[PDB]
Ligand binder design. Structure first.
Ligand SMILES: [Ca+2]
Ligand SMILES: [Ca+2]
Length: 686
């Protein structure tokens, strides 16, 4: 199938995502509405149910509202059954309108609909070439007080109707009982409760297997992507086994939310997007975009440096989901704000690298501060606002122009308030000019592009004051003035003759799993896929066409591989690095080591004889290990995804910068479980 087909569940760079809060978009069935103190039909109390549902989203796919905007994927609230309590927090009644307070991950939330309504939503969406991404929030169930079992539903977890346990009297240890996080350390934020949410214990084999079976069920119902909630608050080693369960079963695009603030650059966040097996909501793009286009706390050089930096720091930048606002920040449009600011920032996101997401109601200029004010019911379904038209004109280009879906980004002209950049993929080009200054024209002189000669019409049709670009020989354009608030997009598309890889998905899996490689120039006759120097040809290539190849990972040792494609004529592509072949299926094992005293700046690490453990190299060792909450220093602990069903060898080591101190003695051995979890508890061997 082509890279742009709705069936391509692995990669989303050719798509535009519309993020819907199901309750707040359209009540297409009022008989499923909550009643009593849980419902506010006027949606004036933004913490109660207003009544919006899956039949409401079906109705807006059918009548052309969402397809007339060119949206090709929708991201909806978590579909699973939630607690039914109305919780009063210091006066206000609050409900699970948002889907985050789960009680059964194997059944639907009846306010949104029945399982038949969920299947009709998947079928209607796909029949209209729309992909469906759902929230999944495995870090917790719901508000709970072990001291007061009558509060809310006491964090109870059920499995397809059957009660597994509650937060009070948790003799099975399904949940963590360490108090609540103060956010001071990454460790602290993982093992203590978020606010009052009953924190799931993924080291318990029952919780582990349950969540892994729950996600597979939703995969069986045809969802196309997963947005994972609170990834900074779950063990990284457990999320790696969770991604390995998705990818080795039915790989679909998965991305998580790790909030970053303005000017926060964090190593940990990038490490997560590069090594977890999932991508991130690109808060580094969003905060810088709001600084330049909304708040004017930085200018175009900031924007340039963020685009140039992020292409390097994210190993797979075409997989990060970009946005200018969402459910966790104030709406981009303000009361006293110019609409042009929103319209430009949206045209910027739609032509930028990554996977653009548009928060519902952006096309209707909704304002509102933080939660719950940014989740009002959307006021109108007008298809004639300037913003609806911008999206309508630009969102198609992700499907037709591979330079917008996969291309590199190149700054071509810049000053404090204008950036003109080029997106380039083989021979396909898109050039975008933006003047953020609303009252001063910009004189453009000396702009060189990669567009061939011709008079390129603005794809926006002049609605944000864009102009035609005349390009002469050598990509040089005639000089022009960019209007106050001017935004124009110019484009040229043709064939590549060369193989060029734009995206690969999944990026982590065991031998035998079919991966999807997307790009242009592969040709129609089946060529060769290289993993390292290993060549895969013939029957192991499941599908070959010019924009997409599906191929089985070969039986190679586990580790990090470079992918390359050769067309049938022997021409080879660019290298798509950092693919992780796993040793096999994964299980999370908790490693606990006692009596490992260290010095300031010295920390404990784990390594061993499989790739998942860094194959005995100190620079790739797992850690630094934790030592505050579940166990305390000098006992250190860590949850590590390791291959299932086999004997591994390993040793612990101390690292103070440059210096590595290995444990003495023989190597440790452990035979891993086939499913579930296990705990290794050993003592530092001098
Ligand atoms: Ca309803
Ligand atoms: Ca947690």
């Amino acid at each position: 199938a082509p890279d742009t087909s709705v069936s391509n569940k692995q990669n989303f760079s050719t798509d535009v995502i519309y993020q819907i809060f199901t309750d707040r978009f359209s009540d297409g069935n009022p008989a499923n509405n909550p009643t009593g103190a849980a419902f506010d039909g006027s949606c004036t109390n933004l913490r109660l149910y207003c009544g919006g549902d899956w039949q409401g989203i079906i109705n807006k796919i059918n009548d052309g509202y969402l397809t007339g905007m060119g949206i090709t994927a929708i991201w909806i609230s978590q579909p699973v059954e939630n607690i039914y309590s109305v919780i009063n927090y210091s006066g206000v009644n609050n409900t699970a309108y948002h889907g985050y307070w789960a009680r059964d991950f194997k059944k639907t939330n009846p306010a949104y609909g029945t399982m038949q309504d969920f299947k009709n939503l998947i079928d209607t969406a796909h029949a209209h070439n729309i992909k469906v991404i759902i929230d999944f929030a495995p870090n917790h169930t719901s508000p709970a007080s072990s001291d007061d079992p009558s509060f809310a539903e006491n964090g109870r977890l059920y499995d397809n109707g059957n009660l597994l346990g509650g937060y009070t009297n948790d003799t099975q240890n399904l949940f963590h009982h360490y108090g609540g996080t103060d956010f001071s350390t990454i460790e602290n934020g993982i093992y203590k409760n978020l606010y009052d949410l009953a924190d799931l214990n993924h080291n318990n084999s029952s919780v582990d297997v349950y969540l892994k079976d729950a996600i597979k069920m939703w995969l069986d119902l045809g969802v196309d992507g997963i947005r994972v909630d609170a990834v900074k608050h779950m063990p990284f080693g457990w999320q790696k086994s969770f991604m390995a369960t998705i990818n080795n079963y039915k790989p679909v695009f998965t991305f998580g939310e790790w909030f970053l603030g303005v000017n926060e650059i964090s190593p940990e966040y990038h490490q997560f997007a590069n090594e977890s097996g999932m991508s991130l909501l690109d808060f580094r793009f969003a905060q810088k975009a709001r600084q330049v286009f909304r708040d004017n706390t930085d200018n175009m050089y900031g924007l340039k440096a963020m685009l140039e930096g992020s292409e390097v720091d994210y190993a797979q930048v075409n997989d990060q989901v970009t946005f200018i606002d969402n459910h966790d920040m104030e709406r981009f449009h303000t009361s006293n704000g110019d609409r042009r600011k929103l319209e430009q920032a949206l045209a910027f996101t739609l032509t930028s690298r990554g996977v653009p997401a548009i928060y519902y109601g952006s096309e209707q200029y909704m304002s509102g501060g933080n939660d719950p004010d940014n989740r009002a019911r959307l006021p109108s379904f007008s298809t004639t606002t300037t913003a609806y038209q911008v999206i309508q004109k630009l969102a198609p280009l992700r499907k037709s122009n591979p330079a917008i879906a996969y291309g590199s980004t190149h700054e071509r002209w810049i000053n404090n308030d204008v950036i003109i950049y080029e997106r380039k993929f083989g021979n396909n080009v898109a050039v975008v000019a933006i003047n953020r200054n609303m009252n001063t024209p910009a004189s453009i002189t000396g702009l060189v592009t990669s567009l061939p000669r011709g008079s390129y019409n603005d794809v926006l049709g002049g609605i944000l004051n864009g102009n035609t670009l005349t390009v002469g020989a050598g990509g040089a354009a005639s000089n022009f003035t960019l209007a106050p608030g001017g935004t124009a997009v110019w484009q040229y598309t043709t064939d590549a003759t060369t193989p060029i890889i734009g995206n690969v998905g999944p990026m982590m899996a065991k031998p035998g799993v079919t991966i999807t490689i997307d790009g242009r120039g592969f040709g129609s006759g089946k060529g060769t896929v290289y993993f390292g120097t290993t060549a895969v040809t013939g029957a192991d290539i499941v599908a070959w066409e010019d924009t997409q190849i599906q191929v089985k990972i070969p039986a190679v040792p586990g580790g990090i591989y470079d992918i390359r494609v050769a067309n049938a004529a022997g021409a080879a592509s660019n290298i798509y690095d950092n693919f992780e072949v796993l040793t096999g299926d994964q299980v999370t094992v908790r490693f606990v080591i006692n009596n490992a005293t260290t010095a300031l700046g010295q920390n404990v690490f784990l390594t061993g004889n499989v790739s998942e453990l860094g194959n005995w190299d100190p620079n790739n060792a797992i850690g630094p290990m934790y030592n505050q909450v579940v166990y305390q220093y000098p006992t250190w602990y860590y949850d590590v995804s390791v291959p299932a069903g086999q004997t591994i060898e390993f040793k612990f080591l101390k690292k103070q910068g440059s210096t590595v101190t290995w444990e003495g003695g023989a190597n440790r051995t452990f035979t891993t479980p086939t499913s579930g979890t296990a705990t290794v508890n050993v003592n530092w061997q001098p």
